[model samples]
Target: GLSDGEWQQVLNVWGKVEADIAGHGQEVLIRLFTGHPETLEKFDKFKHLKTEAEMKASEDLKKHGTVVLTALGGILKKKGHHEAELKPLAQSHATKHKIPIKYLEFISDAIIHVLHSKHPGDFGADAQGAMTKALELFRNDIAAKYKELGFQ
Candidate 1:
């Protein structure tokens, strides 16, 4: 459970990240595809791209990244009290999109890295702890839904 203090800490620093969702979101997606190129096959729009360079130059990639960050912001805005939001997200990932669940961890890790890298001074231990816990809750909620849907 997130205490009020932790939630506020997260909101304080997260506002910075959200300020440039396109820029930060692009980097997170780039990192994911860079480390695990095969995941590109998961997205029909990205599947045709043959190289990382091509992926980097694609506006579609950037837009998709923006979409992801926007969704994440939506959850954060709710302060983790958005089960209804999470269920549809899980449904999209597990069945509608057919994305592998492991990508969620990769993306979350990239988010943590980007948030810290962008604001090292402000994103201190307390903020990191709160953000990590929030993300864990988000990931677990989806994972549980995946399990329920017999996707694991």
Candidate 2:
């Protein structure tokens, strides 16, 4: 339920964060792993990395982060609307990825923080509201899928 301008803001702020692809990638992933350590096991792709620091430094981590963040933003950037694109990724997380709804919260929070931190003047209450709605849309979609699978 974002205005066209608010949707543009979502694209613009994410563009700024994506501009520093590696840095933003590291920052968000660092937040998730550091804040919720056990979630590290969810990433078999990172078994080679022993520590959070190592994981953050790994290019694979950067690439995955960049792809995921940009993909999420890219979805919104294209439609300026709801989160139907989330269904596929959210299903993967619920099943093979084993990412609980709570994990999405941590990632969403980190994303919201990064969004605001990167653009203080532009990311106002309405922008935050729009982002929250979008996250909740994805969250509810994922949660419903998880519930259907008895994973919730």
CA lDDT scores, all candidates in order: 0.84, 0.74
For model 1, the superposed segments whose C-alpha errors exceed 4 Å read none
Q: Which lDDT tens digits does candidate 2 get at residues 1-152?
A: 55677666666666677678767876788778877877777888876677776976788888888887777775766543444666677677877888878988899898887776766777778768767776666667678778878885
Model 2 lDDT vs. the true structure?
0.74
**Model 1, range 1-152, lDDT digits (tens) per residue?**
78999889878877886788888888788788777887777888888778778877889888988998898888887898979888999998899888767888888898888877777786789888999988888998889999999995
**Candidate 1 residue pairs that clash:** none
**lDDT computed for candidate 1:** 0.84
Using lDDT as the measure, the top candidate is 1
Estimate the TM-score for candidate 2. Answer: 0.80
RMSD of 2: 2.6
